[PDB]
Swiss-Prot record, chain B:
Shown segment, full-protein numbering: 1250 to 1297 of 4563
The organism's place on the tree of life at top rank: Eukaryota
Protein name as it appears in the record: Apolipoprotein B-48
Transmembrane spans: none
Biological source species: Homo sapiens
Length: 192, 48, 48
């Protein structure tokens, strides 16, 4: 059923419409009626500066797919970017990471970090804004997260004015017993 | 509710790990609300 | 000689803590109400 075994590291410059992908494939397989293809492929989009890593081993149900997306929104008047990371077991994103950078060198400076986990109800939010102005700089802080019936919020705002100087800070960390109980399973499949 | 838990325990046949009965308040809130504000208006006192 | 003295603004401060079975508030205000008219009213109030 097999004529030979070959292990090969084949590089290929693949086309994605506009983009060109420096694709390197690492495959270990049997050759013949029986195929033992265990492939570890890794692809980079040099036109979208995006890296993708792929592995397939059906014997152990491995179809993992990892993508690191970097999208350039940067210009002379605005340094901006958008970062995306898809943690896909069986090509299903069970952990996702996103970032949005929009910094106007003139006044606006936006930073936003997001963490989301669908199956575990784990979400974290880290968002920052800094509106510059020669007269004054305005600061805003936003950091919050939610997981298993727990709410975490941190709100700190400061602002200067000639008439007055104003500062505040509110700390929020609340937990609901029933909501946490429902969110966190206190039951197991075979335990009953 | 522990009485019902015990009744279930009589057959040694529970359904959950531990006792999901909660004595503590359903809502557990811990917060801090602090602020600093000062009126440094540009007005001034003239002195000789 | 003529000198210009910036006012000593009014200082506002309050921290209010809220936890299960115990809610606590603090509030004090300081600073001259009118630097050039010499009016002070600084007051506090601590409540548990």
């Amino acid at each position: 059923e097999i004529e030979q075994y070959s292990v090969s590291a084949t590089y290929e410059l693949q086309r994605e419409d506009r983009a060109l992908v420096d694709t390197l494939k690492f495959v270990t397989q049997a050759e013949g009626a029986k195929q033992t293809e265990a492939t570890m492929t890794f692809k980079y989009n040099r036109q979208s500066m995006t890296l993708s890593s792929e592995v397939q081993i059906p014997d152990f149900d491995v179809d993992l797919g990892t993508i690191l997306r970097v999208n350039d929104e940067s210009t002379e008047g605005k340094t901006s970017y958008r970062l995306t990371l898809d943690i896909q077991n069986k090509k299903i994103t069970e952990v996702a990471l996103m970032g949005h950078l929009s910094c106007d060198t003139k006044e606006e400076r936006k930073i936003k970090g997001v963490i989301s986990i669908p199956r575990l109800q784990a979400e974290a939010r880290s968002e920052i804004l800094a509106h510059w102005s020669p007269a004054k700089l305005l600061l805003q802080m936003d950091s919050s997260a939610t997981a298993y019936g727990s709410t975490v919020s941190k709100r700190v705002a400061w602002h200067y004015d000639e008439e007055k100087i104003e500062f505040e800070w509110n700390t929020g960390t609340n937990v609901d017993t029933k909501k946490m109980t429902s969110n966190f399973p206190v039951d197991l499949s075979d335990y009953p | 509710t522990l009485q019902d838990h015990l009744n279930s325990l009589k057959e040694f046949n529970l359904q959950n790990m531990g006792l999901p009965d909660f004595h503590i308040p359903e809502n557990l809130f811990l917060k801090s609300d602090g602020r600093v504000k000062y009126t440094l208006n540009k007005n001034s006192l003239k002195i000789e | 000689y003529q000198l210009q003295v910036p006012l000593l603004g009014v200082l506002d401060l309050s921290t209010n803590v809220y936890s299960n079975l115990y809610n606590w508030s603090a509030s004090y205000s300081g600073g001259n109400t009118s630097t050039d008219h010499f009016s002070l009213r600084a007051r506090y109030h601590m409540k548990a």
